[PDB]
Amino acid sequence: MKLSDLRPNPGANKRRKRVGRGPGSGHGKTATRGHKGQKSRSGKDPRRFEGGRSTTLMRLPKRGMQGQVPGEIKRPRYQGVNLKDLARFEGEVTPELLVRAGLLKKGYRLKILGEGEAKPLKVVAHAFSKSALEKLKAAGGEPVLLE
Amino acid sequence: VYQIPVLSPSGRREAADLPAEINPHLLWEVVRWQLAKRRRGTASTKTRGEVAYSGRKIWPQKHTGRARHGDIGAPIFVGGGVVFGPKPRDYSYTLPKKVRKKGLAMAVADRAREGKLLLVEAFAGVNGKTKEFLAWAKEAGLDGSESVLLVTGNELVRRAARNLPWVVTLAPEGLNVYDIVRTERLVMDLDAWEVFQNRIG
């Protein structure tokens, strides 16, 4: 395997579409922009703009709390993980040991959740849902609850 | 698991565990990334506001019978700036470590799969001098009919091999798929062979 062999698979590299470069191309003259009018010009935001009529968005009404200065309130937050996700572990499970595993995102208080089979496991968590608690306290799990 | 010709004074002798199949595309994606990140990207041009001329309307919008123009920096002028000309950029991008890891892996694998790989215990009487290296390479089946990536942390051996045209030298932390693919024959230390396997662990 030398240099002249190194080749990218079919369609791994593909030609650009070069417009405005002669009739046979496609693609020439107008350059796929049709005839006249802004959009053919060099240069309006079509996600929002709608022609001077009141937009689709701006006629919808606002909902709920927008928050005000000095902005967002620090309260604790809870990420759930599902009993099924607890599957790969043996012995004791903490939030710490959940993060460093990529199940529980950092700075999130841990809340065990229902979906899945309770494993007879010591699980240390900031919170348990109902059917999570029952399930565990029935497969012989040990639901330590910290603060 | 590959049987690799090691080279000791105490006999030739043969075990590797290197990738089974070789992805050529993956090999390619690394090189590309290797040759792309080393780009200078010092190609530049001047926009029409970067061009040294004024911005005075050379002649009236109307009634001259000449066409309409603003300043002469307009790219439409021979004086003018270039339109979408090169600006210094950075062709570097971050190739997924795994891919790098697999390429080194697959690059060496391919080569070994061709009995072009040769590990050595040490380097006979090479103590710096280029002829000293010649000697040794001859005794090892390295006549310069084939081109060699010679990988060793041994400063002295690299110095001896360096000025050869058919040799590309390299400390082991420097191993890389391109310098492998360039060269016909890979030749390494045990001591380099280790760091190599450590790179792919």
Add this chain to the structure above:
Amino acid sequence: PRAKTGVVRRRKHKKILKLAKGYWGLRSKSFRKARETLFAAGNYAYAHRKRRKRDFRRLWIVRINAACRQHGLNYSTFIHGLKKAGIEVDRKNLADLAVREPQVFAELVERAKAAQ
């Protein structure tokens, strides 16, 4: 890097200009002028190719018709005669006959009055 026009344009221009040798004045001197004649030359050669097939047939039919009124009957009759006869010698060759081999044509004329 920069890819200046360099060599390309001149060459595409000569190609056309060589294709335009013969034409009157600028049509054979000016590239642009060359291109415009060649476009026209283009369609004409197509259009007249198709047309050449029907220029010769009209001629054959003229030539035959004359030879036919020598033996006392008209092209339209005669042709009807052939079809009835079951003679399908194309009128390219009908023509040739009428001018190279009078006798055979004269044979063909009789089979034609015959089958009528």
Add this chain to the structure above:
Amino acid sequence: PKMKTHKGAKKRVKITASGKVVAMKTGKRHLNWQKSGKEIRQKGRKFVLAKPEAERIKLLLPYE
């Protein structure tokens, strides 16, 4: 430079779990006497925006 989330959207719309765009029914912010309780009751419900326009609003929210 990175897109900015349209706050005007963010503040009157939620993208669902399956990718639909949901908003409050219009029609009850005032002028509400003389409207049936049927009307009012229903206008209290979140609805799903026709697909053509759901897609646009979805591009105003690139970081949801």
Add this chain to the structure above:
RNA sequence: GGGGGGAACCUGGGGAACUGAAACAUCUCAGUACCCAGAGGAGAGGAAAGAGAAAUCGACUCCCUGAGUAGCGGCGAGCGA
């Protein structure tokens, strides 16, 4: 001792409009362009009457992130810790 000069770079004292908002005045462009004064090989900042919720941190600058988050906003365009 000062005075004057110096391509940019810096701090300060002043400070637009085109334009964007498919009009426009709040908004935007922007504390940008520019004018002025001063500094220097850098300049500014700098040892908490700080941060803000952790029984926390511990000067200032600068980079990545936080984050187009919090919020700001004819809750428009947009602005943005």
Add this chain to the structure above:
RNA sequence: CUGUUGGGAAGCAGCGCCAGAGAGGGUGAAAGCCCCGUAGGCGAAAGGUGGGGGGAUAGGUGAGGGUACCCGAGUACCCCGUGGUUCGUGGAGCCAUGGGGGAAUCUGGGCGGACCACCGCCUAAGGCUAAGUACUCCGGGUGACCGAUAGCGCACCAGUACCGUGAGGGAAAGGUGAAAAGAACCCCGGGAGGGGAGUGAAAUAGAGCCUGAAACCGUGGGCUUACAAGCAGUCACGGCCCCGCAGGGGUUGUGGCGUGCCUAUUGAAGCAUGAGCCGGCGACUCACGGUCGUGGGCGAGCUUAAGCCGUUGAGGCGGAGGCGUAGGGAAACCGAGUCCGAACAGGGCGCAAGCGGGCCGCGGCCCGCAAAGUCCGCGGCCGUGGACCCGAAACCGGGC
């Protein structure tokens, strides 16, 4: 080094050699070994630097008890007018302060987003402080940078010529050859120029100089043309010239046919736009985001950023962080559910995982194959920037 072809060898051939140096450039062409170099190494009396080494000096250092002396004033603080911050008057604090009022010295004061109470934080109204940062006139190094319409405006005696009263504007213009060997002398000529001679490998390399395209102008040759009607061509046949020896090439007498190109348009040969002709320059890009598609990597996971180390076209480390793994709700919250509701009706928005093949006494659960996802490459499109290129009338600032 030698031969060899050549004007010239570094080409080709024979036999050698150096290499910590086979980067590059010169030499009559194509040189490791001829030249300048290159790897590796050495070097300053003088001046500058000296953030590294050392030396010195300034300067610096406790505990309890008691006293209540001091702890930065037109300040803090409050009100009025503003500015800064994400904060546009907003529930508007905080920081700065033009106006008015105007304290206290630790049981003092400011702050933690109006205010209050707790609980905490910090000590305003004096000042200095390296480094990490920005820039690039200047030196050097390197380019998937340009190569004389390019690249700076300037490769050249260019901020010049020239233009403008001035601020200010602002060009064009590079090449004989290896070596001037730059063409003695003679001949036509007032000169210019030219013919010989001479130099040269080459002189349509002769200085108005490498290559020497096209428009354009001539000369000579072939075919053709003075009863002919035209977007100039095409088809056919014919004659004359040419190359050759069933064929080609050139031309065109006659016959058929035939409304330029572009643009703009319902519609253009159009008496609608643009174009004298030729040459050169000229317009869908890039960055960061986004969204599909796609080639790959890995997959309940995937990926690093800045940095650090290494390299001197070698890569590695760095898990901060981001995206994914759960949703629903304005939110508290609850959670495979959740919101509305009195509901254990009804409804909105959510929730179900692959395909195997086998071992074993029905899946126990392996094992493979595939995939959520994600990372990079590629491409299409979108956002933000001048965003395909050229063009206003104008607005504003500072100058003349």
Add this chain to the structure above:
RNA sequence: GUGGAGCCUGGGAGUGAGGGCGCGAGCGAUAACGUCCGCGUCCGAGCGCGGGAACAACCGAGACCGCCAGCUAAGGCCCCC
């Protein structure tokens, strides 16, 4: 009824000045190469080809290329032809 039919999901569009003709109406004057709708068509994009003297849209006919072969459409068959 297997067709460049159809339905579903997504990427990319252009288009949003039409026009003539037949027919149905409104307007107009049982005017206009008029105007405004409906059904259809063709030009647009078939100013390619035959007819119609000429001639986008009337008749005929949807041109991948070549042929000095044949049948035809509309239209024609006195000479131009």
Add this chain to the structure above:
RNA sequence: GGAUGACCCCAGGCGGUAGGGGAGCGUUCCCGAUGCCGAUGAAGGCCGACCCGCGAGGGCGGCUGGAGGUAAGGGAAGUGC
């Protein structure tokens, strides 16, 4: 049919502006390159009635030119008037 782009047979489609898509050509530059072509002549220029390709083009030959050129396969754009 064969066994997956290898060709053969048979049938059908192949007017076309905006426009969508697909396959190519050529220009500059990088890897390939301490290589290969090169004074027994590079690039470039002028010819050609010759070869290959549907085509863009690519060869081959002659003249000029006198020092460069740059493959198979890939990469990147100041890429075709």
Add this chain to the structure above:
RNA sequence: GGGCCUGACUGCGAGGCCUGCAAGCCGAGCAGGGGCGAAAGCCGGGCCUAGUGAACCGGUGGUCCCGUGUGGAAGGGCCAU
């Protein structure tokens, strides 16, 4: 024409009309609590099709959902208007 009455209900809403969007329109049925009826049953305004106004910004009532270190409070949210 009269009797009693407040269904000119509050939770919802299978399924449809219409429709580019946004809206507009019809609605049987389950639950709460009622009206009239002996009952079957009917009643979620008016014989029907016009009598209307998207968001933003505010006012009032309720709710007690957030409340910037904590308890409150300021201010917002939700339901109604």
